[PDB]
Amino acid sequence: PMFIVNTNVPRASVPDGFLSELTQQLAQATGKPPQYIAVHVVPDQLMAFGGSSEPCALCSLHSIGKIGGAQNRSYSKLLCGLLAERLRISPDRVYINYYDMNAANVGWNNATFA
Amino acid sequence: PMFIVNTNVPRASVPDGFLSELTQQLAQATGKPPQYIAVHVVPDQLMAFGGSSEPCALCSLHSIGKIGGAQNRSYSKLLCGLLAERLRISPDRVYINYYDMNAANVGWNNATFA
Amino acid sequence: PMFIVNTNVPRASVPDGFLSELTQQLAQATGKPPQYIAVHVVPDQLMAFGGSSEPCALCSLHSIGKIGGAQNRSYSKLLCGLLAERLRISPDRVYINYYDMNAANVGWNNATFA
């Protein structure tokens, strides 16, 4: 799985250890080993949500499976929780796009996951 | 809706007010309330289009519905027009990927839109 | 086609000529003329792969057709090979998400590719 968060919160406001926390929590949530979890945090962005530049985040979770209505509700609670606690972003200023990737549409280690 | 633009145009070349202009015009074009429109502009990027590093942009528009051939044509005219007028990017140097998101695949405010 | 690499490798480690090399090789791999290939490299990112921050990359390749299991295996060999040779990223620390875009879902030059 791969999780990306783009935010206007400044770099100094991202706590040390945040990448590791995301990795651990996403390994637990998705059920996948942490070795297969990739995380990417992009602070200091020029962005707005609802016309406002108060803190916000635009995120993506890509996984081969482990994506669906109920799972995505749980992921949203988890990840909005983390973003609120760690980055002080209101959950109602977070969008998370979920992508259920076909194995053959993910490249890794010179080939695909098919 | 979520609109992201990545460009090699420099930050100083992005006019004041641009994120609000985008928000307003996207709310109108998609029919969605402005409170649901997110916009993100990423200048000073290392990119090329057709092998050239003249001004260009790589963009995405995600929406829960309001995506299709005629709508996307309309969006492209709008957005290429704004990138040309405001960022001086030629329309033939812009790619915009459109995504029709299922409501269950968009997280927001601790849950999804499903 | 549009290729985007996000990596923690520092900008100074991206060799001169890299965007052109990507453009040339992708034109060739996809069979599409280089005038239609866009490339984007984002260095200096805050990311982790498998819980660690050695060099890694998170990438995407979007194309109107030319996407499928065999083709994507070919692309992954090519692109991991370039990322290893030029950026010294291990192929096992690269993910590439592949997207087969419908022509009507790609904006360009004030309209779509439909």
Swiss-Prot record, chains A, B, C:
Keywords attached to this entry: Acetylation, Cytokine, Cytoplasm, Immunity, Inflammatory response, Innate immunity, Isomerase, Secreted
Induction comment from the UniProt entry of this chain: Up-regulated in concanavalin-A-treated lymphocytes. Up-regulated in macrophages upon exposure to M.tuberculosis antigens.
GO cellular component terms, A-Z: cell surface; cytoplasm; cytosol; extracellular exosome; extracellular region; extracellular space; ficolin-1-rich granule lumen; nucleoplasm
Subcellular location: Secreted; Cytoplasm
Main location (coarse class): secreted
Active site location: 1 (proton acceptor)
Binding-site residues, substrate: 32, 64, 97
Reactions mediated catalytically: 3-phenylpyruvate = enol-phenylpyruvate; L-dopachrome = 5,6-dihydroxyindole-2-carboxylate
One Pfam entry name: MIF
Residue positions where N6-succinyllysine is found in the record: 77
GO MF entry, a single one: cytokine receptor binding
One GO term of the biological process aspect: positive regulation of cytokine production
Enzyme class: isomerase
Enzyme Commission number, as recorded: 5.3.2.1, 5.3.3.12
Modified residues (N6-acetyllysine): 77
Note: Serum levels of MIF are elevated in patients with severe sepsis or septic shock. High levels of MIF are correlated with low survival. Drugs that inhibit tautomerase activity protect against death due to sepsis.
Noted disease: Rheumatoid arthritis systemic juvenile: An inflammatory articular disorder with systemic onset beginning before the age of 16. It represents a subgroup of juvenile arthritis associated with severe extraarticular features and occasionally fatal complications. During active phases of the disorder, patients display a typical daily spiking fever, an evanescent macular rash, lymphadenopathy, hepatosplenomegaly, serositis, myalgia and arthritis.
Family to which the UniProt record says this protein belongs: Belongs to the MIF family.
Function summary: Pro-inflammatory cytokine involved in the innate immune response to bacterial pathogens. The expression of MIF at sites of inflammation suggests a role as mediator in regulating the function of macrophages in host defense. Counteracts the anti-inflammatory activity of glucocorticoids. Has phenylpyruvate tautomerase and dopachrome tautomerase activity (in vitro), but the physiological substrate is not known. It is not clear whether the tautomerase activity has any physiological relevance, and whether it is important for cytokine activity.
Assembly description: Homotrimer. Interacts with CXCR2 extracellular domain. Interacts with the CD74 extracellular domain, USO1, COPS5 and BNIPL.
Protein name: Macrophage migration inhibitory factor
